[PDB]
Amino acid sequence: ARAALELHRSLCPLLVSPRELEFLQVRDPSFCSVSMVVTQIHYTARFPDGTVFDSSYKRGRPLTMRIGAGKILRGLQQGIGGGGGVTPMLVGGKRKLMIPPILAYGPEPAGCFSEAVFAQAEMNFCALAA
């Protein structure tokens, strides 16, 4: 399959700061860091220009993952737990990311009789911890 519908806003950010590996951008840091343990975030992922293909809000409880052991996109694990040259996101923080296609799925898609991600894409995120 391929993209479906959604609706939201974005709370327009400042200019992104690439920091030599990815595209970093901060919106609101609040409370406290997180070690290599289970976290619980809320995402809303875009395509490079406009399209939205999934959003944690399109389901119930925002999904829960592991920040610290490689189980997620390297871009995220660099931009949520804190990468080289980037401060980690607080407990109630909120950040915005543009993921280059080397820290992502790379130059091959994920097919299901129709690739659910454009081959060699580079997507966007609006990640808010919880």
Burial (0-12, 13-18, 19+ Cβ within 10 Å), 99: buried
Structure tokens at 61: 């409880």
Among 19, 27, 55, 115, binds another protein (CB under 8 A): 115
Nearest distance, CB of residue 46 and another protein, angstroms: 10
Q: If binding is defined by CB under 8 A, does position 17 make contact with another protein?
A: no
For another protein, the closer of residues 28 and 33 by Cβ is 33
Q: If binding is defined by CB under 8 A, does position 42 make contact with another protein?
A: no
Among 12, 14, 15, 110, binds another protein (CB under 8 A): 110
Among 48, 87, 91, 100, binds another protein (CB under 8 A): 48
Q: If binding is defined by CB under 8 A, does position 5 make contact with another protein?
A: no
* Distances in whole angstroms, Cα of residue 8 to Cα of each of 5, 54, 57, 116: 11, 11, 10, 21
Q: If binding is defined by CB under 8 A, does position 13 make contact with another protein?
A: no
First and final C-alpha spacing in the chain: 30
Kindly determine how many residues on this chain lie close enough to bind another protein according to the rule CB under 8 A: 40
Contact 80, 64 (CB under 8 A): no
- To 10 degrees, the CA torsion angle through 26, 32, 38, 43? -30
For another protein, the closer of residues 32 and 69 by Cβ is 69
Among 24, 52, 73, 86, binds another protein (CB under 8 A): 73
3-state secondary structure of 56: helix
